[PDB]
Amino acid sequence: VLSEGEWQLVLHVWAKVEADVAGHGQDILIRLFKSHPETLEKFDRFKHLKTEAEMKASEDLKKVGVTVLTALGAILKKKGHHEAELKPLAQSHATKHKIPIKYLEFISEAIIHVLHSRHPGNFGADAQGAMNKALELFRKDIAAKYKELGYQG
Ligand code: HEM
Ligand SMILES: O=N[O-]
Ligand SMILES: O=N[O-]
Ligand SMILES: O=N[O-]
Ligand SMILES: O=N[O-]
Structure with missing residues (x-):
């Protein structure tokens, strides 16, 4: 479970993503x-x-x-x-x-x-750790759902 402070670090960097979601999406898929x-x-x-x-x-x-x-x-x-x-x-x-x-x-x-x-200005170590925690939670919950749905994952 993330703290409020961890969620704020996640959402602070996400706000920058939202300045140009299409560009970020290209960069991420290409990567x-x-x-x-x-x-x-x-x-x-x-x-x-x-x-x-x-x-x-x-x-x-x-x-x-x-x-x-x-x-x-x-x-x-x-x-x-x-x-x-x-x-x-x-x-x-x-x-x-x-x-x-x-x-x-x-x-x-x-x-x-x-x-x-x-985003080095919004993605120092603490912010990256928060994002990783949020993504790990996402993956954990998706994995639990996959199992309920019958998919090995
Ligand atoms: C953060 C992780 C991800 C999110 C939030 C996400 C979300 C979505 C959403 C909303 C769609 C359109 C509606 C749907 O079909 O559910 C989509 C389509 C799809 N996603 Fe993902 N996705 C993720 C990761 C992945 C990954 C890692 C792959 C493959 C390695 C993948 C493969 C696909 C494919 C093949 C489609 C259909 C794309 C098309 O329209 O041509 N997704 N995804
Ligand atoms: O500004 N949201 O894509
Ligand atoms: O389109 N799903 O990554
Ligand atoms: O794309 N992972 O470094
Ligand atoms: O369940 N949607 O393809």
Whole structure:
């Protein structure tokens, strides 16, 4: 369980994400696909993309990135009271997309990498620790949901 002070550090850096959600979404997905290329294979709509430049030029990739970061933002703004948000997300990611927990760990690492690079003023060690805690809580709750839903994860 996060303290209020930890949630404020999470939401302070998220506020900067929200200055340019589309840009942050491109950076984060690209980081994920570069660091863990296997994850790209889950995205039927752009698994053909071969280079970062092609990734950056993809309007569809940008849209997906906005969608992810917006749904995650909505979760973070719940400050752990996110059961309603997590239900449809867990269902689609378990059953339709088949996203293992390992892959959610990879995107968490990509989020942390991008925030560290872009937002050093709001992402010093304490802030990064808070974000990691919030993302770990997210993954823990999604994992519990996956198990309820019948998906190994
Ligand atoms: C912070 C973690 C994540 C969040 C909040 C998130 C959220 C979303 C949302 C809201 C959608 C659209 C509605 C839906 O289908 O549920 C979506 C679509 C999808 N997500 Fe995620 N997602 C996350 C992580 C991942 C990861 C790590 C992968 C793959 C490695 C993945 C694969 C997909 C795929 C394949 C789609 C369909 C994309 C398309 O429209 O072409 N997601 N995600
Ligand atoms: O300003 N929110 O994307
Ligand atoms: O589009 N889900 O990362
Ligand atoms: O459960 N939604 O694909
Ligand atoms: O993308 N992780 O450093």
